[PDB]
Design a protein around this ligand. Sequence first.
Ligand code: NA
Lengths: 4, 401
Amino acid sequence: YXFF
Amino acid sequence: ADLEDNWETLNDNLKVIEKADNAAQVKDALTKMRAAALDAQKATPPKLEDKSPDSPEMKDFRHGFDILVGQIDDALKLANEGKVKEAQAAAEQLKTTRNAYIQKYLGARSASSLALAIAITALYSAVCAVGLLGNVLVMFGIVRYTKMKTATNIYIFNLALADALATSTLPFQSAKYLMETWPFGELLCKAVLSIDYYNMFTSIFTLTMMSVDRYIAVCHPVKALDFRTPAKAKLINICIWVLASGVGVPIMVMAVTRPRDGAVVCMLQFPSPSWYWDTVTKICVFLFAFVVPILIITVCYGLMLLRLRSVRLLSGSKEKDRSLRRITRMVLVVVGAFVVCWAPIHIFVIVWTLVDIDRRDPLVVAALHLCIALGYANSSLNPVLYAFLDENFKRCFRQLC
Ligand code: NA
């Protein structure tokens, strides 16, 4: 965590 | 770096020049492009990194920007004479020159960027190994042995499952960072992203319920007999997964692979407006998977302190009393370790999303990735905490090695  | 920013501003202002009504817009765009160009010319591109500043490749690179600037100047001359469309045409020529003579030098990642990918791959590998082996051992131990079937240990089984799954994704994520692309297909993209969210939600929900279980074991010994069975713990585990699927399923659906800039990216595609739902999700994740659960856990322990500190006989035996007390201490420590591990990234994400920070600054990006890594590290730390803090896990560990 996190991602695009 | 400054180069990629300067290059982005060149492109952005070329687009401004294309769709422009008047010479003021064109002049302003061209003037900004010139500053960016002069700045860009002072950089060392990643493809020529640690080459001598006076090498053929560097001289040629810089020379390309002298040509661009010369063309920006001509285009600006035209724009100042009122000749908008000729200036626009001249600017279309920059794009050709830029692509034909400078493009080759841009493209690659820098050594620092590759260094980051290698360090992340190192840490993720260590985490995967200890985490995956460690939690598979915990799950096997809980199933295999009679003495392990306890309410508290069924909850632990749920943590181990989430952690086993989370750590199983790390080699794939590592590969992405090294290759700068996603070669594993869409299904495994959906799996990895949704597992990330499941880990976060099921874990904290489970830790919340372990705290509540402890609260009941200590402050309500009589009612605890009714509530605290392995079967009911299992039941609550399932509920946790069902509830967490409220976020997990949407993530499965929105997770896609797309070709973008010569690579395949695995990403979350939110509905329009993307930026809005992305931000709603992030604030929801922060509240419902961190803040609110922590309040509940805090309350549960607050009420437990009244009985834990201000008494001596909790149960009707020495063995049971010390057993009730150390299991309660373990849960607090596991909770603590979870909060310590996860708080940094959770704060970072909110700051990254809401505040105008330099998202391309080497230090910020390094710190961010360290914080992401620390979140995953939680998974490898937990098996070791069970061995350290619980009698039966120590005995199970020693029997293995
Ligand atoms: Na976890």
